[PDB]
Every structure is written in structure tokens, then in C-alpha cells.
Design a protein around this nucleic acid. Sequence first.
DNA 1: CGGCATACG
DNA 2: CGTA
DNA 3: GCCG
Length: 327
Amino acid sequence: MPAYACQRPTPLTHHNTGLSEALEILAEAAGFEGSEGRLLTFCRAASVLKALPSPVTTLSQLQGLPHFGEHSSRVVQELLEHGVCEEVERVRRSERYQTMKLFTQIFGVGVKTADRWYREGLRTLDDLREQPQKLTQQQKAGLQHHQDLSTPVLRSDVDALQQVVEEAVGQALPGATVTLTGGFRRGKLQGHDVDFLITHPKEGQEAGLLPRVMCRLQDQGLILYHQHAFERSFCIFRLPQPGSWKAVRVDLVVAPVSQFPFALLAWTGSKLFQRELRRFSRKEKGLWLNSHGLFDPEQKTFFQAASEEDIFRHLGLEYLPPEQRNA
DNA sequence: CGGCATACG
DNA sequence: CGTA
DNA sequence: GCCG
Ligand SMILES: O=c1ccn([C@@H]2O[C@H](COP(=O)(O)NP(=O)(O)OP(=O)(O)O)[C@@H](O)[C@H]2O)c(=O)[nH]1
Ligand SMILES: [Cl-]
Ligand SMILES: [Mg+2]
Ligand SMILES: [Mg+2]
Ligand code: NA
């Protein structure tokens, strides 16, 4: 078992679901406390279990696995022996965990804002609604639409959205393309949002595109919230439903075609997969990876990729299709 | 011990 | 600060 | 919290 998540296939569904979920609770709780390092270790341990070919049944099966030391091994031991880990259950029912989870789930609220509200005594969404002067416009939208945004987006919903985005994109710049990215590209059947990547085959034509797309979607009555020269948009869309509609989060990113492989890689995820890939690139290969390119800081050159396959090859990694990037 | 991904709105 |  |  390699130490980096980008060195091993991780399927969406696997054989250690309960164990990985427990470790991910501890990872989330570590993030609520500001402990990025412990969040990373618990996430990495969870992801190792997702990559295994069969269920862990005995503690000895953790020996030699990366990211399993005394703490994560103890968690697994207790789940195997008793079906429950006392530390995990203590987190799950703690007021701090439940409130931070509730607040950070709001679009426009991160850990720092959630923690400040917690320390001020706030505990519920109605507590926030009663003092709307303290909310940004983004947070007001997140709070108004919170119920709809809490319901999973269905893969059945995604086709209809992609069609309306393509219509606006085609009027804004004929020949521009729309690619589904994020979790749905990795094979997920549900999601918290829909992520799209937009480009054009002629380098440079994509400049200035996203404002033109957003204006056209807003004119068609489809935008419930957006932030407005930009290249990323984090929107709330009106999605039709039988006799009505629902609010859905939609992310749009524009990239030049020269950067498209890097952008596709970066926005397909998973989040942990990309963090691990960027860490691998920098620490093992001495190359700096981001959503725009791959930089050799010694030669001061960028690697010209024509595909995701090119990028894996330049990093000396076996190619993983999106469905195996579910770290 | 240092390090933990990266950038745009 | 928020977001991906 | 764990790796190197
Ligand atoms: O912090 C982040 C968040 C997101 N991303 C990148 O942006 C992609 C989309 O970010 P996302 O927040 O839409 N997550 P996704 O994997 O689509 O699952 P879901 O919760 O169902 O929407 C992720 O899969 C990563 O590739 C990052 O690189 N860093
Ligand atoms: Cl990214
Ligand atoms: Mg998504
Ligand atoms: Mg998204
Ligand atoms: Na949030």
C-alpha cells in the first residue's frame, strides 16, 4: 500500500465503509478545532481503507498500512470489537460538533465564522436569522436557500442543467464547450452541487467569457444568487421540478484550452486526491502542480500537457480514471 | 523535528 | 474572510 | 496524527 492516495486506485464504493466513516468524523472534528494536520492524517487513514480489496476483520490487518498509528488503530480496534468507538460517539453527540457542522454547511460560512458564532452563543439557524445584520449577502443567500441546498442533487438532475448552461455558453461564445467535472465525473450518483468546466478550442477566445455566460443565465431567470472580470463562479440556480423548482448549487470555471487538462484534473477531484497529488508532485518530483499547469522551478519551464494521461505520465504515476480518484 | 495543496472571488 |  |  503506497503512502500517497494518488498512487493507488480508490473506487467510489468499497469494503470498509463503516470504518472509513468513523475516521472521517474525527477528521471533520479536527478541522472544526483548527487542526489541519490531524484532519489530514484521519482523512488519509480513511482513504487507505477505501483502497483495500476486502474488509478489515482483525487488527493485525492494519500492520504496515500507512497512516495507521496508535490513535487510528485504536479507533478501528474498538469498532471491530464493540461495533462502536466511544471517542467517535462522543464527538457525534457533542454540541460543538453538531453546531459547527450545521453552521459550516451554510454557503458563505466557513470554520472561522462558525467558531466565532459558536463562541458568541449562537446554536441554530433561527438564531442566525434573528440577527440578519451580521450576515453577508452571500450568507443571507445560503441561509435562505439552506433547505433546498441540503437535499442531494441527483445525477438525473445534471443533464437538464448541463443543457441550459450549454445554451447560454453557445450564445456567449459559439464553439465553447461545457464539461461535467467534480464528483459526478467520478461516478457519484448524488452531489452537493454540479461542477462544470468551460473552454474553447482556439486559445485566447475564452478570455472574458464567464461574465457573458452569467449575464445570459441571469436574463433567462435561472440565477437565484451569484457574486455579480472573473473565471470562477459559485452560483445558486433555479432547477425545474414537477409543478415547481428547487435551488441547486452550480460551479462554473473557465480555462484556456492550453490549461484544460490541468483544470480538468484539478476540478475532478476528489479534494483529498488533489491535495495528495500536489503534495506528491512537490515533495517527490520537485514539480509544482496547480489547476493551471505543472512547473519545474529549476528549469523555470511549464509542462505542456494535452491530456490528463500526459500529466500522470510526467509525474511518473500510473493513470487513474476519474472513477478511481475517490480518495 | 518540519510539513501538511493551491488559487480565485 | 469566503469558495472550488 | 502520522511520515520521513
Ligand atoms: O478545497 C477544495 C474543494 C474542492 N476542490 C476541487 O474541486 C472539486 C469540486 O469541489 P466540490 O466541493 O464540488 N466537491 P465534489 O467532489 O464535487 O463532491 P460534492 O460534495 O458532491 O460536490 C473537488 O472534487 C476538487 O477537485 C479542491 O481542489 N479543493
Ligand atoms: Cl483546485
Ligand atoms: Mg461538486
Ligand atoms: Mg463545487
Ligand atoms: Na460553508
